[PDB]
Subunit: 193 residues, 4 copies
Amino acid sequence: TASTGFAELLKDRREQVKMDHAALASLLGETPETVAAWENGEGGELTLTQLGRIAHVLGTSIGALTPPAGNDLDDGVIIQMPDERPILKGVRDNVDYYVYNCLVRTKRAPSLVPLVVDVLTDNPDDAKFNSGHAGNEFLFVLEGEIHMKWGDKENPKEALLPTGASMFVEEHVPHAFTAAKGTGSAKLIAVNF
Amino acid sequence: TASTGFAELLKDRREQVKMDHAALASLLGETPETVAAWENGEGGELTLTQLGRIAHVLGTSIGALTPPAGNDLDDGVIIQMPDERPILKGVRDNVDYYVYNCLVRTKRAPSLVPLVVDVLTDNPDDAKFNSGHAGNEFLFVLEGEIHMKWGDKENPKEALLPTGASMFVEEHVPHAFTAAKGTGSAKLIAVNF
Amino acid sequence: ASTGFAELLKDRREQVKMDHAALASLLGETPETVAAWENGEGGELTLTQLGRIAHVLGTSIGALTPPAGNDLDDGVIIQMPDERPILKGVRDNVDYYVYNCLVRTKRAPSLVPLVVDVLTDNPDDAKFNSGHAGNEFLFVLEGEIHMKWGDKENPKEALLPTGASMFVEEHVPHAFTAAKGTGSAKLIAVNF
Amino acid sequence: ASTGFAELLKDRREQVKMDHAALASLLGETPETVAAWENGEGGELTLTQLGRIAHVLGTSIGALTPPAGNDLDDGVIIQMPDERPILKGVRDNVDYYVYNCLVRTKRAPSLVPLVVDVLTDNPDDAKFNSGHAGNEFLFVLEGEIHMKWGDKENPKEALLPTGASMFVEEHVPHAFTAAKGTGSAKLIAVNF
Ligand SMILES: C[C@H](O)CP(=O)(O)O
Ligand SMILES: C[C@H](O)CP(=O)(O)O
Ligand SMILES: C[C@H](O)CP(=O)(O)O
Ligand SMILES: C[C@H](O)CP(=O)(O)O
Ligand SMILES: [Fe+2]
Ligand SMILES: [Fe+2]
Ligand SMILES: [Fe+2]
Ligand SMILES: [Fe+2]
């Protein structure tokens, strides 16, 4: 698969840049038989570094010589039951801030990371910001009331969101969440796409 | 804005294809002063058809001569309260099938269409399929139990999903939802991205 | 254009879950008017109106208008050396280049190939541009080329003979002239 | 490569909300091993292993390896006419083309420009390829070119003189030969 895809993309690329097994090999200090081996599907044990060397000589990246993520769908769909969710308890400055209940994901859409996030803290004065992250994020308040903070960590804008509120935070925008003051905790669905 | 952006992109494009006001005008049967007018920001009343003519002569599309959607965010975010959601009641074969409660949207991410969908029907035998649609869709069961159908309308695969189940349906894949048999109705959050 | 709009408009309207009435209300129009646009009767809408329609639909005019289109003869388009447009380029008052525009296609709008005649031959009076979108491949067709790039006040430079090839990343400003006192040179420039 | 992986691996791990222990468990590795990879010590991982790591992280090997890289001198790279690679292409047992490879760059991997010597001159024995990814711009450098394209058994054709330019959409199969009995011709081919 990785090995197979590599073999195909290696040949595709070698041929688009006008090299034969010899020129490529000569260029990489390998034997034509070796390079042919790789194109036969025997490149599985090539190291990350060697793959780098190969991509270099071929004027491209490892990515362009490796296959796409692959298909994990059943006739177009994938399902996840409520009790098979992976769980990570997020700590921020030695404080148990959030609990990430990871929802369904798919190799067909790598950037889709949907989550149910338990917001453990309920003291807006102590909101712990992140530094922003790549990818846009859609949020929805599943329950309780949320105190949202965003922008500059020292002088941030704020918003109090009741159950049912929907939000969007552009990529790289730093943000932090807590339950409404004294309400203990709240919950939300977060969709990174 | 539309007028302004057009003026800028028109000049950018005219210059990349090596035309002066005259050649372009001559080519479009207009006067150099007219074409200069458009590049001055006076193209606002140009019709869709005329824009088509212009894109054609310039060997490109209207899209490439018009500005991107624009920015509607407050320092990176946009919020929607639970009671300002637009509402459309979807009818399928003269049956009130779903109720779409549209959540927050943004011109910064045009393809993001998040929704809370009330699933009105509760008779799996009468599920009304759609023919599939562009764009991938993430689903989450907010409440009740959902009876999902997908694939061929005549011989579809099925799944019974309890509250908290998350799903993904690849683009173009036809699908239909109903509440679990006899349970009356269910609800879900649907995120098209 | 009208027909493309009609189809793309309907697709986008359904995408955001809007029926004719909903869209019409937001635009101050009537549902019948929206139905007509979706029926191919939108040709007379103005650039400003289209901008408003796109805004209401949370997208761009571009997402509602059709792609450039096709102008190929089964994947191919040709251009005879005598049927090509010419543009005499002048910079700061001097015939600097002459642009002989080669084949272009609606299927790849960004492809702008050209035979450029480098008219001047004094590298000291070389006249820079200020960079441009898109990368550019160049090949010295004839004569010798004196290339300058980067900061017009602190440029990197190179003397290139016939047959030399080069790549100029987008935005990087650059300038060319024939080798000092050699009259003129020629190059093929492919912007993609 | 090792350092790029290290950074991209950490970004992706956090993205899917996985700590070192979670990732290690899924891979049957120890958290210390994962921390080392994220510390730049992943150079010895195999193609197969990387494939497994990507799978577990719901993505591709490509999303975890760094971009091609930079090889430009302030946005520009040059190639003298004498420092270019050559590949003598043979089709069905006959020297058909000679490929004189022009400048390429890691900043635009798909750009493959070339001076191609069309060696044969019998359009009847024209030898097709089977189309290829990417579009291609062509310019007749010298002599007269006889172009064929489409279905090798039911082809469209055109006789092109020096200076003619053409565009061939991706996948469209094609073949070239010098005009009947004229020995050979030459063309610049830019795949982008
Ligand atoms: C809820 C938050 O969006 C989760 P984070 O991005 O801060 O990890
Ligand atoms: C819930 C469904 O996904 C809404 P539809 O795509 O059928 O309009
Ligand atoms: C030769 C140059 O590349 C043409 P310019 O981009 O300056 O228009
Ligand atoms: C001239 C041709 O375009 C080169 P080929 O693509 O057949 O390798
Ligand atoms: Fe976040
Ligand atoms: Fe749907
Ligand atoms: Fe240029
Ligand atoms: Fe080709």
